[PDB]
Amino acid sequence: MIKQRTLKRIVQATGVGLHTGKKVTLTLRPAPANTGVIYRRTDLNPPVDFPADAKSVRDTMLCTCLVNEHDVRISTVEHLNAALAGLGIDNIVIEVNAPEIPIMDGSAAPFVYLLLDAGIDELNCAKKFVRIKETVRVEDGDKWAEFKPYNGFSLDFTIDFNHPAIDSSNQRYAMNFSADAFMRQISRARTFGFMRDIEYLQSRGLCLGGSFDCAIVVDDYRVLNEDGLRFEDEFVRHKMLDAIGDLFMCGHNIIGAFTAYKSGHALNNKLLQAVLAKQEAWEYVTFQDDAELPLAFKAP
């Protein structure tokens, strides 16, 4: 039987928050079966829990955040969340002594190593997948994203970049998901932003943790980062990192074909909720026989 997984040990890392510019201590914890992914703030007293849920997502100007009953928020969860999907973590408690998850280097890669340190612990309970049964499409103007039936997990991302530092050769990335593919092709792709916008926010006391160390930054004409890009198509690669993170907000690996045109947090999540809302459009599945497991979701 393909089992749910959690961490073997508690681990912790430190980093700067994109918003506050302050040191944030991150602590990952093992958790029992079926409890799923939980983000927790410990700066507040008492601590607040934010169960990872498609409904609780809000796409803020900077990255994304989760919201509770009272509109208290925990921010910048999506990159770490993507790494959770990547390494196949089902149950876990994620604590920060601050309003946000550290931004680190702008990618998911630093989280990969952190999770590796924590190790994997298989729990004696079946792991549930969300198998796409019907085609489901959502749009926003000329933008669209859809899930289609397919025995595996694939993503086909196209984003409209009109920037001089992003070539037409590098607007599209497509992959068949797998822990290995995620760690090597996707995890190191950093987030990006426009330099004047960031200057402005920082002049207004926002985005204070922003630096070359946490994001690709471009002016009107070129990438400003001394060392350039980790990939020629690092931008679209990070957008797929973000898509994986968005989709995993439901706490389950999805079996199907993801396709998106100019999609983003808002639209990815809109698809996710649309799919989950239509009862006939999907179903839970478990694998007693380990060999039935689709290629995409085998251990790393």
Ligand SMILES: C[C@@H](O)[C@H](NC(=O)c1ccc(C#CC#Cc2cccc(N)c2)cc1)C(=O)N=O
């Ligand atoms: C792209 C988008 O979807 C999203 N990214 C963000 O919202 C975002 C926005 C800004 C920054 C940044 C910065 C900086 C700086 C800097 C450099 C040099 C000197 C100084 N003073 C400052 C990083 C991420 C995302 O990844 N969501 O998952």
Ligand SMILES: C#Cc1ccc(C(=O)N[C@H](C(=O)N=O)[C@@H](C)O)cc1
């Ligand atoms: C707060 C805030 C804030 C949010 C978004 C913008 C923005 O759209 N900037 C424009 C731009 O094209 N950026 O790439 C143009 C204006 O540069 C500016 C400020």
Ligand SMILES: [Zn+2]
């Ligand atoms: Zn991102």
